[PDB]
Amino acid sequence: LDPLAYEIWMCIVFAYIGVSVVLFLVSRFSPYEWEF
Amino acid sequence: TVERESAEDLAKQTEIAYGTLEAGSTKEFFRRSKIAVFEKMWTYMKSAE
Amino acid sequence: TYIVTTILEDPYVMLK
Amino acid sequence: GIATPKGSALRGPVNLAVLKLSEQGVLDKLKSKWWYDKGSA
Helix, strand or coil, X not given: CCCCCHXXXXXXXXXXXXXXXXXXXXXXXXXXCCCC | CCXXXXXXXXXXXXXXXXXXXXXXXXXXXXXCCCCHHHHHHHHHHHCCC | CCXXXXXXXXXXXXXX | CCCCCCCCCCHHHHHHHXXXXXXXXXXXXXXXXXXXXXXXX
């Protein structure tokens, strides 16, 4: 993990959780089409 | 790759501190030197903490 | 004794 | 150069004093003393 600082690794996990929740929200709340 | 010898190697860096014996010929050699490298080394050694 | 005019300029003339 | 008023009586002695100081290595010593000795993720 040395090539990337500990702050980069922490923010990647935060970005991973943030993208996953946003991608689920914009896919399921739409009643026109509603797997994601 | 950056993780892939001389007098300058010591004079040139500052991460490694280099000293001498007190009241010795080596200290006196460095104190009364007039060579650029040795004068630079003495100025560093005299004011090192 | 006459006056030697001078200027403040490092390292020529400094106040101790 | 060390200056003097035009028509001064100190003109010649000052010139010779500077020549003596230069030929005796005094100016070199004064210069050396006052200039050199200052010194990933």
